[PDB]
Amino acid sequence: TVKAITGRQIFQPLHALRNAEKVLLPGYHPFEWQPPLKNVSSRTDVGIIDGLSGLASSVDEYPVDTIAKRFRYDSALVSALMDMEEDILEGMRSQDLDDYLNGPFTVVVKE
DNA sequence: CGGGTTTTTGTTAAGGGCTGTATCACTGTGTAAGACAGGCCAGATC
DNA sequence: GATCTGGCCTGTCTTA
DNA sequence: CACAGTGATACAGCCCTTAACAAAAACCCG
């Protein structure tokens, strides 16, 4: 309606937003653990995956009737850290530190 | 009223990229009480 | 003193 | 034959390029 009345593209179409979404969602930024994760793959492009984690759905074994969707924890934390980079940099600048510091950060979480 | 001359307007083919629209399988709003027929015990009775 | 009547109940159906 | 949504996918539609030609709308002159 805005583009039809005004005649100027103040907002972009839906596909532009759909394309821009791929920057904030997890499984987009590269990373690497010091000591390789145990029993965990190294794919850094793992988005939304099935929550059943490959659970068998055959009629023979234990009947399962639940669906699930979830991210991968490590990619989730990577996306979370990418989301709040500006706040971390501002906190470093406020406490009279250097922006080029790379000391071991400590991040506590609440499940 | 035409040639000579000039400035606009398409026209083909193939490929790229942005925009708009149809298509898929579905939902949430239609949600408490009353009329009535049948069975059954307590009791007045002739 | 069994014998129906009356009312009490009670499950079912009809709209929501 | 209730009907307005609801997010992702595919495809039509509508812009873009080069390349010579080819037609259309006007003014000097005859």
UniProtKB/Swiss-Prot annotation:
Maturing lymphoid cells and central nervous system. Autoubiquitinated in the presence of CDC34/UBCH3. Disruption phenotype: Mice display a severe combined immunodeficiency phenotype. The have a small lymphoid organs that do not contain mature B and T-lymphocytes. The arrest of B- and T-cell differentiation occurs at an early stage and correlates with the inability to perform V(D)J recombination. The frequency of homologous immunoglobulin pairing is much lower. No obvious neuroanatomical or behavioral abnormalities have been observed. It comes from the Eukaryota. It is found in: Nucleus. Coiled coil: none annotated. The RING-type zinc finger mediates the E3 ubiquitin-protein ligase activity. Catalytic component of the RAG complex, a multiprotein complex that mediates the DNA cleavage phase during V(D)J recombination. V(D)J recombination assembles a diverse repertoire of immunoglobulin and T-cell receptor genes in developing B and T-lymphocytes through rearrangement of different V (variable), in some cases D (diversity), and J (joining) gene segments. In the RAG complex, RAG1 mediates the DNA-binding to the conserved recombination signal sequences (RSS) and catalyzes the DNA cleavage activities by introducing a double-strand break between the RSS and the adjacent coding segment. Homodimer. Component of the RAG complex composed of core components RAG1 and RAG2, and associated component HMGB1 or HMGB2. Interacts with DCAF1, leading to recruitment of the CUL4A-RBX1-DDB1-DCAF1/VPRBP complex to ubiquitinate proteins and limit error-prone repair during V(D)J recombination. Belongs to the RAG1 family. This is V(D)J recombination-activating protein 1. It comes from Mus musculus.
